[PDB]
Structures are given as C-alpha cells and as structure tokens.
Ligand binder design. Structure first.
Ligand SMILES: CC(C)(C)C(=O)N[C@@H](C(=O)NO)c1ccc(-c2ccsc2)cc1
Ligand SMILES: CC(C)(C)C(=O)N[C@@H](C(=O)NO)c1ccc(-c2ccsc2)cc1
Ligand SMILES: CC(C)(C)C(=O)N[C@@H](C(=O)NO)c1ccc(-c2ccsc2)cc1
Ligand SMILES: [Zn+2]
Ligand SMILES: [Zn+2]
Ligand SMILES: [Zn+2]
Ligand SMILES: [Zn+2]
Ligand SMILES: [Zn+2]
Ligand SMILES: [Zn+2]
Lengths: 517, 513, 519
C-alpha cells in the first residue's frame, strides 16, 4: 500500500474525481407529444431531412409558446440546412417577454445514424456548451433513435462535456461552468427514462477508466493503481485481493515477475470479485493488461514512431476492467460471478531488468525464451490467464494495448478480437454492437505457430519470421489457456484518441454489456 | 501481337512459357483402400497419423499384397518411427518378384483433420522424396481422413510443388504413374482431372510472376495473354495508348508515362454457349515492375528486387482464364481484365503531387507514386462497371501493410456487398486458398478529402493503409457489387523463393460454383 | 563459490550443466576393412564417393561378410544411386541368418580430399538418419580417404551434432529422444585411427561444454554463476583455481574491466584456472577469453537495426572456449607445459551506476583510456586481462573474443580472424587451425591506424575516429597492453553462433587445445 518515492515531491496516489459535475445535472425526460416548453438556457433541436442531401431545416415538434413557434416556422428555418454536424444559435423573446436561446444540430439525410455519426452530433452539441455559461440544456429529438443509441448519445454527451483538470494548477479554465439541468424531449419517453441513469453509470465507468489512463506514470504506478482499485472495491462492496510479490513467487508467476524486475515499484496483482445474490449461472474472468509505463525495457522504444511518451496508456486494459467493475458493481446484475483481474507492473531499464534472450518460466510450467523485452504485455497476461483459468470460469476475456500492428490492420476506430471459441467471440461482437464500441474479428492463424518454436525453451515469446504481430501474439496467449472459452481484445490502436489528445476509456461499456447481457 | 521494344539486341522479346509439363504426362489411378494395397512398382508412401498420442509411433493398418513389404511394415519396425507432421522415412528393398521398390511414410501429426497448411507440409515432405527419386511410379496410401476438396488440394499442391521451373537455367526423373489408395475411391476420381487443370492454371500464373521484368513487360505479358486466348478460343482485345487516351484513363496512363514499354490493357472474355445468367468481371493488378517511381523503393525492407511480382493479380486472373476456358462452365459470362504497365523513374514519369483525371471524371491528387496500383485499378474498375456485370472482383498486390495484418498465409477481402463477400469466403473454403474478411471503415473516408483534387490517392496519417486503399477503390464503383482481394502478403513464398500463384483456384471456384 | 544475487526468488542461481551426456554412453569399436564388414542390428552406413565423376554412380568396394547383403550391394544394384555430396538412402533386406538389417550410404561427392566444410555436410546427412529412428547401433564404413585429423573431426562433429540440448525444456521435451549405445567404424589401417577415438570424445565434450555455457541465457549465466561453474570444473579436473572479486580487482587497479561492470547487479568475477605438468615445465601459456555474460551495449545501447541484442548472451563465447579448452587439457594431461586459463567476467548494463561515454578510466598498467563508445567493452575487459596475463611471465598469450561485428563483413561466419605481434606464434595458431579443422585466417595489424587512437586528454582512445576497420583498430588497442610477450588475438564474433541451426558452435575449444598440445 505504501507508494515508494525517489523524492518527497513524488506523488503517492492517483488523483481521482468521483463526484463529477456531470453527477450534479438533474436530468428530466418528457414526451414530445405534450409540446416543448422553451423558458431558459439553451434548447437544441436534433433535426434531419431524409432523402434530400443538405436539405432545409424544419421543426416538426409542437412548441408551447406563441413567439418561439412563430420564430421556428418553416419559412424562417428554410435558410438553414441539416448537414451532419451543422449547428446554429437563435435568440428571441418568448410569451413571458423573456429572452431565450434556441438552436439545432444537423443530423444529415440518413434515417439511422451510425456510431461515428452520432458522436459527430454530440461533438457539435458540446461546442455549443463550451464558451457559453448556461445553467440548463434542453434537447429535442426529432430524429429516430433506439434505446441503445439514445443511451449512447447521453454517455457520449457526458464524457465529451466533462473536462479533466486534475493536473491543472495555474491554468484552470476560469470560465468553467457546467449546466445544472438537462431536459430531453423524445417520442415514447417512458421507454427511454430508464436509459438515463444507466448512461450516467456507463459514463462514469468510462470516465474513471479515462482518469486512470490519462494519469501519468509518476502518479499512476503499480502501487497507486492497486491502491485505487481497492478504494473502488471498498466503495462498491466488492470483495478484493491484492497479490504482492511474495504471493506471486509462491504462485511461480515467473513471466509476470520478470517484466517487473527492473522497476522501483513492486508488482501488484489486482483481483476484484462481484457475485450476484443467489444462483450463479455464469462465471466470468476479465483480464486487463496493466503496464503503468512501457519503456520497452532493454529493447528500448527509441525508433522513430515508437511514441514512448504515450506509454502511460499501456494500462488501458486494466483501466477498462476497473471501469467495468464500477459499472457492474453499481448496476448489480443477477446470476453472474465476475472476476476483475490485472497483473500490474512497470517495464523499465535497470541493472535489475530482465534481458533479451532470458528464459523464464510461467506459472503453468512452460519455459519462455524472451526475444524482445518490449513484448512484455503477453508475458504478464500469460500468468494472468493461467490464474484466471484456475478460478474455474466459463469465459476468459482479456483486453490489452498489445500490438502496434493494430494501427496497420484496423486503425484507430476498430479494436480486434481474437479467440479460441466462436460462441464467446460472437458474444463479444454482439456486445460491440449494443455498446457501440466497434470491434472486428481477426483470425488466429495456426500456420504461424511453428515460428514460435524455440531451440532451447518450450516456446518463443515472439516470432521471426512472421511480421503479423497481432496474430502471433494471440498465438502466444492461446498456449496459456488449456480448456476454457477465451477471447482477446487488442485495443492498442483505439485506446488513445490522437486527434483529441486524451483516452477514450475504450472497452468499459463493451465489457459491461457483455457481462449484463 | 505487338513488337516489344529493346534497349540492346540481347534484350528478350517474349516470356518463355511451358504449356506441356511432365505433370500432364502423369497417369493417375485411384483405388479403394478397403481392398488392400498392391506394391510391386516404384515408390509407395503411407500417410499416417496417431490421434491422441503426440509424436506417437507409426502404425500401418493397410494389408499389402507383398510378403517382403508386409514384413517391413510390421508394427515392431514401424514404431521405431514417429508421426510428427512432415517427418518421413523411406527404404529401398526387393519385393516378392525380386524387383526393386521403395517403401515409406509421411507423418500427419496427431490431429485427425488436416488444415491446408498441414496438408502442404505433408506434400512438401513427399515432394522432397520425389526430387531424389528416379522410379517411374509413386503410390500414395491415405491412412488419414480427407474430404473431396482437400484431396483435390493434395493433388494440386503435389503437382505444383513437384514441378520445377527451369526456363531461365542454361539425380531424378518425373514419374509416369501416380496411384492413390483412399476410402470411397469412386467419389474422388472426379477430382483428379480438376486438380490437373487447377494445377496448370496455378503453375501458369506462377510462370508469369516468376518471369523477370526484363522478360515479362507490358507488351510481352499482353502478347502472352493473346496467345492464351487463342489457345482457349476466348475472345480477346488489347487496348493500346491511343484508345486508352480516347477512353481518358488518366490514372492508368499516368503510372505508365515513365516506362519504355507502352501501356497495354488486357481484355479477355469467356462466354457460355447457352443463355447468360451471370456476368462477372475479374480485375487483376498488372504492374510488371514496381520501382516505386519517384517515391523510389529505397527504404530498408522495401524489397525492390521482388517487384517483378507486382503483376501477380494479373497472373491470377489469366490463370483463372485458363481454368475457366478449359472447364467451360455454363450460363456465365466472364471478363478477364488487367491494366498493365510498368512503374519507372524517368524524365517522363508522373510526379508526387501531380493531379490526374480518371476516366469517370474524378481528379486524383497523387501523394505517393508508389501507391500506383490503386490508380491503375481505378481506371480498370471504371472500365469493368461499364460492361454491366453482376459482380466485380479485383485481386492485387496492393498494400505491404497486409504483412502486418494477416501476414503471409491469409489474404484480405474488402467489399461493398455482403453477399459477394460471403461468396468469396465460401470460394476460399472450397479452394483452400485462405482469405479473411476485413472491414471498409467509413470513418476513415474523410482522410481522402483533397484540398484541391476531387480525392486524395493516399492518406497522410491513417496508417490503416489496406482499408484506406479499399476506400479509394470503392469511389470508382458506383452501383455494382464489388470485392477487393489484397494478396500483397500472400503472393510470394519467401521461404521457397517462388510464387504461390495465389488466387487462381480461389477465383475459379468463385465462377464455377 | 559465491552467492548469486536475485531480484525475485524465481531468478535462477546456477547454470544447469550436463556432464554425463548420452554420447559418453556410446561404446566405439574400430575395425579394419580388410577383415570384411559384418552387418547386423542397427544401421550400417557406407561413406562413398566417385572421383572426378560428379554425381557418379554408387559403388561399394568393401568386403561384406554376408552373401545376401553382398548380393544386394552389388554394382548392378547400386548404379541407380549417385554420390552427390550429402545424398543419403536407406536400404532394407534380410541377411544370411534370416534377420532383417538396415543398410545405406551417404554420398561424399566427386573429390577425394574432403574439406572440413564438406565433411560437416556428410555428418549432417548422417545425423538426419539418426534422428527420428530408434536405433541401438550405428556402423560406419569409410570408403573414402581421410587422415587421422579429419577422421577425428568426423567423430567430433557426429557427436556434437547428434547431441540435443534439453536443459531449458520443461513441457516440450522430445518424447522420442533415444540414442544409440554402440558405434562401429570400419576403416583401412584401423589400428592407426584408434587413438583418435577417445581424443574425439574429449574434444566433443570440451566443445559441447562451451556450447552449453554460451547457449545458457544471461539470467542463468551471469558473472557469479559463470565463475561458479568454472570453479566446479576446476574441482572435477584437479586444476588450480582463483576467483578474484571486486576488492582484489580494486587492489590490482583494474579500472578498465571494473568500469564495464559498474552498471551490473552482478559483481565482477575474474576467473583464473591453472594446469601444470608434473614434469619440468618447458613452456608457459596464458589463454584469455572475453567474458561478457550479457552485452546490452551500455549507454550506447544496441538499438540500431541488425544489432541483435537478443543474441548478446553469446558475448562470453571467448570465455566458454577457454573453459572448454581447460576441460580438454585437464583430461588429456599434456606434459612439460603450464597453462593459465583466464577470463575477466562481467555484464555490460544500463544503470544509474553505469560507466558513461566520454568517461576516462585507468587500466591496471597505468594507461588512461577515453571511452568513446560504451558498447566497445570487450577490449576494455581484455586490456586488464592482458596486463594480468603478462605479469604471470608466460611464453605465449592467446586471447579469443567475440570482439567486433565487422568480422561478419571481413571473414563472415566460417573463418575466424587472427591478429598478433609475433609471426611464429601466428603460424602456430594457423597450424592448429589446420589440425583441429577450426578455420582461421591471418589478418593484419595495420600500424598506420594507430594514430587515430591518439586521445586529446587521455593516453589513448578506446575506439577510432576515422577508420571503420573496427577489427584492426581493436587489435591495435589491445596490442598497447602487451609489452614484451608473444601475443595473438582470435576474433570469433562472426563464427561463434550458428545462425542457420540457431545454436552455438563451441568454436575455438579444439583450436586452442591443439595449440597447447602440439608443442
Ligand atoms: C514493438 C512491437 C512490434 C514488439 C510491439 O508490438 N510492441 C507493442 C508493445 O510495446 N507491447 O508491450 C506495442 C507497440 C506500440 C503500440 C502502440 C499502440 C498505439 S501507439 C503505439 C502498442 C503496443
Ligand atoms: C508503401 C505503401 C504503404 C504505399 C504500400 O503499401 N506500397 C505497396 C505498393 O508499392 N503498391 O503499389 C506495397 C509495398 C510493399 C509490398 C510488399 C509486399 C510483400 S513484400 C513488399 C506490397 C505493396
Ligand atoms: C559496433 C562496434 C564497432 C562497436 C562493435 O564491433 N561492437 C561489438 C561489441 O558490441 N563489442 O562489445 C560487436 C557488435 C556486434 C556483434 C555481433 C556479432 C554477431 S552478431 C552481432 C559482435 C560484436
Ligand atoms: Zn512493450
Ligand atoms: Zn506494452
Ligand atoms: Zn508501388
Ligand atoms: Zn505496386
Ligand atoms: Zn559491446
Ligand atoms: Zn561485447
């Protein structure tokens, strides 16, 4: 629990915001058939025009105000169009002779919006929220969205609206004011009301993950991260267990322990557990890669394009699992038992570091020839997977920033899923659809297995020949699951939002939807 | 035929092609294994596995009609050997009639069902024995389980790997007979002559790919296509620069500008005798050498000495033309297309930054002259859609990034129509040429928005270049089902230093079934 | 024996060493061909060639004491097979006693004088016949002309290549691992070749022992665990031994060697083994091996493409060769000679405690050295070892080291390079290269390059500025630490590791031993 320091100025904990401004927003949902009351703050209409590309804007909703209705006549709205992402502000007086702000956001010509489309809309909406001190936002849905897309709108709204200022000091935004009320007008609102607080849960789980990832490696280290996981578990009444080095040694986790050797921080294996009250139908282990900083070790990330300064993100997998733990522990699903696992450590350069060429022994007794110390993720998951299987679960799903090759195969939008079981894979893909976090199925090609044959050890860590890293890595991991349905989600490409310079918190909602449904 | 230009009189003016191979002279018999085996001639090899027992002992179950070989095959002798996938042994001995025979086995592992990767290992081990064999007959006994497709794969692979390409050259002899013992022999007999056709289609494509760029150029390759068309009685047409200019194929012609060889657009057509119920266009990338242009392949690992293989897509299509023109399917009309050129460095070459206009009217800003494949394909695809076909399938050594996604075994397929993709995937299964469905991610499309042209050729940032390329090609197919097979990673067999002729059997199964 | 420091309790604390190998269980019998060949159980392989006629037909000229086998192996039956170098075939037949026997041949080409490289091709073919076949015996019939040395080389290579290192296998041990118990050899003038058999078995293990050390990863083979293994070897051979630690190294003022090791968690250990004859000593020799148990490069980290930092466990190959030579010498026990076996062992790591590029360090002979590259550490450790060596007062100093990557561009992977300050000694190394069949080539120490080692602040630069001819410059540097003693330097950076087979060669063991013995 005691975070070691080099100097007294070194942080001893991760700053974490639980009570966010988003949580102080009173969210009300009304049915659109009763007409919209425009009284205060900003009222935004979500409007589209099916068929006609860049077609005119029309407000079909009934507006419980004479003046505002007249303003929003088709004659006045004709000049503006519905191009996806477009937004305009309006200013007028209502029946009460009060000034009020109104606007709209263009949702395009398609009848149904995709994942990227809805995010575009939310991002336009957020630009209306920034640099404008408002106390209330009202959103009127004049497009068709199902419950999962509606929930996604809210989660995305909350996430993008929220600004992380934990590490700001002399440069806090002096104009940072959040709305206190959120009104939503939608058709058949009763069915959507339950999606509100689910979205706020999904929002924080994601933002919590984001907070851990964005936290630099001097704040977020194996000790502080495991201390944080404990605190979360305590707040959620989850059972928790943190495995220290001596316990890890008894479990003979040589692959995991070797990776952490060069670090000033002791390895910490995180093990949280949720169990439903009553009969457990499904037991699930979620495994997240928890490298708090990845320098590459003696295979130092020195080559152009290696992006060593991003490598605080190499615990994004762990963060996803902890975010999921928040969501699951909050929403309390029935008939499941969930283990949240992460072999957390740091990959550093030291006199004590493991070397290229070292042969190390995993907890399942397999000897491993280390070909590249910067392929340290699969080493820690190997021992984590053996641990997961010993729990006697039905499903093991690991999530990890494992291979840079994902940027060349799927890019920055879709994560890859590999596995040994088609049913689990389809459950993952299904959860991908309902969580609106895109995943694509990639193959474990067995012809490459021979390239992991070692002359001296039981198996090679990395291949040579084969340059298909994501597949070879999946081949390696498969060797540490003997007979359990297993899947592997490589989020190396999608975890960090390069354009926005922040984490996505990718995987929290995906893993939660998998566990819940 | 066109006169291929020369720099010096020693420059070759055609691609040497072998049509009649020793493989075609092999007489193939298929016997049912239930009746026991005859072993009086040549080389006999047993395909053996041991389920459950990894690297377990060899055990031969078949009864053989020779006492001398029966003693050799007894369990106490054979258990000295093991069934590790690819492991083989063979011994020479006299049989009952005092004739010299050779007897052995190839291990097939401990898994009862072989993948095509496993089967290729087995065949390779077999071929190695054949390359040191002078006997006239090989007999293969399947003490394993294979379905009709995998058995046809076994024969195709055997024929292909057995054959050695000696065209450019200035201990063994080819067998005259092949015997097969296998359960339910009658139902496999129809796969033999299909395997012999698939073999040559694959091997012919292989000859074109392996043909160096001084032998195989746009003129000589198009000449060969014509000669293939003439032998198969296919309709054919070669479009030269003048008619390509009139068709306004600015993208295609821009790539060729810097070459001493004029661009040649290959168009072969197979039309069935009966009514036509499906029209297909098959499009193959045909770069006879890819230097990279002014974006020269100079970086470490760019493997410029390999780039004679950049017309592998074209070879696959032409090899498919052979199989289709030979097997003569019904109710179908197939167009075999290839915009052939050479990508070179010259005073006349297209430049990075040049804005060029495709035949469909779109202007393209060239960001990288080494992304030349998609430019040629763009005009090819515009040509194909004007034919009014139900399906357009293109196949191309398009993006090196395939090595980082699927690697050297699996090709990637992208497309705009789920039905066509599933048909490709189904064809991958029955042809045993592995292919994986990859996505065309629409969120990346914005990276192709040019400041000045209608569209960018490449992205500046995206990194997912195989998908970005697919998005580029997609822009030139307006309302036809279209799929794109990227064979950049799978075309060349790096370990064996030769082509695979990948795609011939895949495409043929697609049009046949 | 020192205690090996651990970071975690799962860190290994010794090198696993296999002394009693299955090769040592093989009984070898040598017969004269004049008596005829008996063919029974196991595998009987004829080594045949056909002079002049490339890929000519196989002919078996040896007498075979079996009518059935003789009939099978008659000219008319063999002419369908050819003698292409490396070709092999298996035969099956019943002999005069109605027992089934296995026979065959390995083609030895169309040249009567087989080179050491072509002989390795023959042995590898023969080994492929041994693998995946549970045999109790192998018989070899030499129908080619080989001298005593090449015959011994055949046996050494057979033993070495047949052997399979499974020390680090856990779940992936080969279940079908079974070795012959008997080896028969038929050859003309057999009584003259018999003396080579045990010599070959000794040379095999000396070579195989070195290979085990080299192949051992750096978490197993570190300076403490390696010096410990040297102690154990000396104890089994009754060699004198002394392991010098940091304290005594400091007293001896070995600043160059010590600075290399500063960055490691493992303390420096200087190995000193000694063999002395019971007879009057007539010549004294020191053998010096480079002993970097892992070479990360230091602050000049190996991060450049093609630097193969994952191979860097090999960087104690020189030390391994010397220790392998110690085994052979302590076993064969040469007379009238005193041999010192030396290695300044350490690990070149990156650390707050590491030595830095630009550092100026003082060697044990008082020479100050300016460090231009932390990855040029071998010659620093050797500098102090060479000074130490000459203080012993010996006749010859020979060092062996994986020193410079440039060797791959000069001699490649087959020939080692030898440099020196004495012609007579160099000729003897070249002579031992011939009689051991470990290829070495004489390379010059070009004095004109010496000026590029002129330091502005120190007495001498570690590395050159101009040059690029690293192997020669490094030799120039080393020469500065040998005042008045015959000295030779064997660079084995190119030949140490077998890249195709992914294993060490144990190169240098036989070479050094032949050098010790043949004088
Ligand atoms: C360096 C290589 C090819 C071995 C690799 O795949 N590295 C992983 C890694 O360091 N795993 O521990 C890697 C490299 C880069 C990234 C990455 C992802 C988004 S930007 C950089 C992610 C993983
Ligand atoms: C260099 C880049 C990213 C533009 C690319 O994908 N180039 C293609 C190409 O030259 N298309 O015309 C490319 C690069 C390398 C290969 C390749 C495949 C196996 S080895 C090299 C294949 C295609
Ligand atoms: C790079 C240079 C010139 C300093 C050099 O010779 N380096 C040595 C070395 O690191 N000595 O400590 C070196 C580099 C590479 C090799 C090598 C040999 C086979 S693969 C790499 C061997 C020695
Ligand atoms: Zn890494
Ligand atoms: Zn990592
Ligand atoms: Zn190109
Ligand atoms: Zn190309
Ligand atoms: Zn070095
Ligand atoms: Zn070194």
């Amino acid at each position: 629990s005691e975070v070691p320091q080099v100097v007294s100025l070194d942080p001893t904990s991760i700053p974490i915001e639980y009570n966010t401004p988003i949580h102080d927003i009173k969210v009300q949902v009304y049915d659109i058939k009763g007409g919209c009351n425009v009284e205060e703050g900003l009222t935004i209409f979500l409007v589209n025009n099916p068929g006609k590309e860049n077609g005119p804007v029309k407000i079909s909703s009934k507006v419980n105000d004479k003046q505002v209705s007249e303003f929003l006549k088709d004659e006045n709205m004709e000049k503006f169009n519905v191009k996806l992402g477009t937004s305009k502000h309006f200013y007028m007086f209502n029946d009460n002779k009060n000034s009020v702000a109104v606007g709209y956001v263009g949702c395009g010509s398609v009848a149904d919006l995709s994942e990227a489309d809805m995010k575009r809309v939310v991002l336009s909406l957020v630009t209306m929220l920034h640099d404008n001190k408002l106390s209330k936002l009202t959103v009127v849905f004049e497009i068709n969205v199902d419950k999962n897309l509606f929930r996604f709108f809210l989660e995305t709204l909350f996430y993008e609206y929220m600004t992380d200022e934990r590490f700001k000091s002399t440069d806090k935004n002096v104009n940072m004011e959040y709305i206190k009320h959120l009104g939503v007008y939608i058709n058949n609102a009763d069915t959507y009301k339950e999606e509100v607080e689910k979205a706020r849960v999904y929002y924080f789980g994601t933002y919590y993950a984001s907070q851990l990832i964005a936290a630099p490696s001097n704040y977020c280290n194996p000790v502080s991260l495991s201390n944080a996981a404990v605190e979360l578990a305590q707040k959620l009444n989850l059972e928790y267990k943190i495995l220290g080095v001596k316990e890890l040694e008894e479990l003979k986790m040589g692959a995991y322990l070797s990776v952490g050797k060069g670090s000033m921080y002791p390895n910490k294996f995180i093990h949280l557990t949720y169990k439903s009250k009553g009969d457990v139908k499904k037991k699930i282990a979620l495994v997240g890669k928890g490298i708090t900083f990845d320098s590459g070790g003696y295979n130092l990330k020195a080559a152009p394009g290696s992006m060593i300064d991003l490598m605080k993100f190499d615990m994004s997998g762990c963060a996803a699992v902890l975010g999921c733990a928040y969501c699951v522990g909050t929403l309390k699903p029935e008939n499941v038992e969930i283990h949240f696992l992460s072999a957390v450590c740091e990959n550093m350069v030291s006199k004590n570091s493991y070397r290229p060429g070292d042969i190390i022994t995993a907890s399942n007794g397999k000897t491993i020839e280390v070909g590249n110390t910067d392929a340290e993720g699969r080493l820690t998951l190997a021992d984590a997977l053996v641990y997961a299987e010993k729990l006697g679960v039905d499903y093991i799903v690991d999530i990890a920033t494992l291979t840079g090759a994902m940027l060349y195969s799927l890019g920055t939008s879709y994560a890859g899923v590999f596995g040994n079981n088609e049913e689990l894979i389809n459950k993952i893909l299904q959860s991908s659809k309902t969580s609106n976090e895109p995943v694509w199925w990639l193959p474990i090609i067995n012809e490459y297995r021979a390239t992991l044959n070692s002359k001296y050890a039981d198996i090679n860590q990395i291949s040579s020949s084969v340059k298909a890293s994501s597949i070879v890595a999946s081949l390696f991991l498969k060797e540490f699951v003997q007979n359990t349905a297993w899947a592997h989600i490589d989020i190396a490409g999608v975890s960090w939002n390069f354009k926005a310079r922040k984490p996505k918190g990718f995987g929290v909602r995906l893993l939660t939807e998998f566990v819940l449904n």
